[PDB]
Amino acid sequence: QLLVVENTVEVAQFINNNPEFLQLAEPFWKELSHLPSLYDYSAYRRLIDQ
Amino acid sequence: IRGGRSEYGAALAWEKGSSGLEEKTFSEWLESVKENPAVIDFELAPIVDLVRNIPCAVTKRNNLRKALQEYAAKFDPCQCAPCPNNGRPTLSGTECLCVCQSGTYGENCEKQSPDYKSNAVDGQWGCWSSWSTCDATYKRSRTRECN
Amino acid sequence: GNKRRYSAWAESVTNLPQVIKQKLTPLYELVKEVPCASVKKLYLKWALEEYLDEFDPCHCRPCQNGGLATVEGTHCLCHCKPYTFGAACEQGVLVGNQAGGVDGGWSCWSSWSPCVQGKKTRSRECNNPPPSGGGRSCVGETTESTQCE
Amino acid sequence: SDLEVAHYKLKPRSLMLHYEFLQRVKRLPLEYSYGEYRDLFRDFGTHYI
Amino acid sequence: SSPVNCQWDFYAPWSECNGCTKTQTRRRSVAVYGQYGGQPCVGNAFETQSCEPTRGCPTEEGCGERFRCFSGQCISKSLVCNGDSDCDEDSADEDRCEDSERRPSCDIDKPPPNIELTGNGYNELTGQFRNRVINTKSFGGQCRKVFSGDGKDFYRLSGNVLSYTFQVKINNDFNYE
Amino acid sequence: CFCDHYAWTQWTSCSKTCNSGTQSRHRQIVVDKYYQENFCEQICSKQETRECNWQRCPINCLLGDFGPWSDCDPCIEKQSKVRSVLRPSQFGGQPCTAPLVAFQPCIPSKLCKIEEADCKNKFRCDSGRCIARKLECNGENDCGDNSDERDCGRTKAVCTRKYNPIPSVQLMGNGFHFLAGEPRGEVLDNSFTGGICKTVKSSRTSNPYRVPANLENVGFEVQTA
Amino acid sequence: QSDEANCRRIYKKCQHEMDQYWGIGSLASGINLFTNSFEGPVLDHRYYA
Amino acid sequence: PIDGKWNCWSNWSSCSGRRKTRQRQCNNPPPQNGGSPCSGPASETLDC
Amino acid sequence: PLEYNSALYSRIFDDFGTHYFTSGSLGGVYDLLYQFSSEELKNSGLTEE
Lengths: 50, 147, 149, 49, 177, 225, 49, 48, 49
What we know:
The structure is cut from a larger assembly and holds 3 copies of chain A, 3 copies of chain B and 3 copies of chain D.
Chain A: E1 2-9, E2 13-15, H1 26-34, H2 41-49
Chain B: H1 6-14, H2 23-35, E1 38-46, H3 57-75, E2 88-91, E3 95-99, E4 104-105, E5 111-112
Antiparallel strand pairs in B: 2-3, 4-5
Chain D: H1 19-26, H2 34-44
Family (chain I): Belongs to the complement C6/C7/C8/C9 family.
Subcellular location (chain I): Secreted; Target cell membrane
Protein name (chain I): Complement component C6
């Protein structure tokens, strides 16, 4: 039996800002714009899927 | 391996270890460490010293100092259970992670190397009590039990 | 693998690195800058829990031999430990070393108690499978409680 | 060997159609007449990625 | 073990009606998960109905004094006509802009080698990275250079990323038996 | 003895789920001519035992109730509600999973008392930072948005050359989270040159590295530590 | 080019040298799912807006 | 080994459980040390 | 905010940490462990009658 397990890390960290200062991607934002503003789970499930 | 450049760090990490250091490899890695060092040690100062030359700088500084005292009291790692093998706990607010002494490994430092001595040597701070009621001289106090 | 093969790979991952460690924030925290943003944010919170309900492998009866069940659409699969093939991982044998037994597994949450005093409550039962043969206990709390809406 | 070299995603909305597909859709009869929609599929398939 | 074929639940009661589309919906949950190779439940999990809406469709707010990207995202006018695409998919802030009026926003344009992966969403159950949620390349008109040290190159970070650093770690484990 | 002839029983179930139980197994010994002659009684191990479940038992996270909503800040106009961890998870217990802080849009009672800082004479960058007036038109970007260079005549040729940045110098300017022992967001801009060219050369062959103004000293001596 | 004819001044937005994504045009063509066959073009992956 | 092949699924049955059927007829697996039977669903049923 | 709010201010420690380096040392760390094990049994029995 042999096991090898290995990692290399090249970006020690990235830290994204908190949600106040994050800029949304235009497509994701444009999708949020069309969310039905009511609990129609069919839409939100599409968002969570994508 | 920590610090260096990916090629030479990788190459050095891949040495079987039957031999110890391959001087070519180690020396190249050290050169890359000169090219891309990693933090080894440091002397901290509190971040509240830095808030300066801003609108309401003093109000925000004193609010931040109060918030720091509350935040530390809220997230002091003495609410962690103790790490084994003299591992030291650290708290990411919701989870405690153990940092391992050299000569112990596994995810929470659970298994010793063959050389490891003095097993179950222990000792680390508990956190402070809440403050006492004010004494005769109107001083409060708190204590931590080394427990 | 050859030392040169591995070193060339480890260099090339400098230019095409993947994400390999992460800390996560719920997606609803990003609902922003839109009409009714605050309402949609709440509804997306409620959507995420419903999604997890739809997908928690608690819905899957156990695999043998430590196979991991997971939800794939409307049916489960077993992700078998190496060389332990078949529909439930019933075939073949495990390589390496194991503690054996049957590791216990959580059954799905009950529906919440209805907001008594403004508080919800729910429970789980660790019977899928029950821990057996010295297999380890299921890991986690049996019950939860929370504020209402 | 399974090797993966990129991930692709198409936008979900307001897609720009190809001229040939655009024309071929325009010419579709409003009445249901299977053979023309079949020819559409034969020319361009049934699905997009 | 026996295959078990999936079974649906009954249909749920309808959603409230969408004031924009005027459509209701109802889902049909799985009553029994198919298992051990049993058949998945066939058909769609949902159906739709037309309605008469009780609620109005909320309108967009404008950008006001802010610049309006063609999608309708808004940005500070200081980013307009700037030499950076501060609208991300649209680049309307850089439309109709004289290159003699532009100034070089930064020495460089090259972001870190895969920073876009830091902007993907993530699915915790499946564990797979999903599509682009955050714009990782809004430079905000800053010239935020970092020297990678590793990789021996300069990269331009976005204006808002809290940190991005290139110290390296390696881990190797062998088990011969 | 060829001790494999007296094959092992399978490992006894792990003595405990966690905190290092042990599992063990005897051989299928049969006392026989082969057992007597080949020193098999002497040198075959009758049983073996090993450690198992060495990882420490998991600890699950626990949380308290949310407190009251805070009195609304008139400038942020969000009211904040918080709760505290009663014990952390560790050793692979259930994560706390729920957010520790909630925000709600209020309608505030008070007005904001904020005002902009005029910083007297200092050059106000468009970001609203003020920097020493001499850094206007300095020939380099010190406002970060180049607004000190927004429009200039005879900019000073501050430095003769594009001197190199110090290795990883920004790591010196990241903040640190002492309760977690890990770096966090960037706090000091160790790109800021102060408008001076002061420089340190690591070796006679090395190019001079430009020292950023946040650093009082750098040394390049190699130590083993 | 009917968008670029008669223009008094052209505002070249990308001064830079740009490649297309490799094989990106193939993904713009629809598939017959049943046959897994790529067919005629359905989406225009040379439109950049 | 002859592996199974499905015939075409039968036409849609009437409402009260709209339904189709399949028979593995198109190539019955058993011949020549037959291969695997065909996958299901040997019959399939749906809303009207 | 100018008024005190423990949450909003605590996000400063979450994002940027509690402290900063006044001084320190940068370099690298090498750690290795190797653990070989080997065993050999031989048997050579002869019996004759």
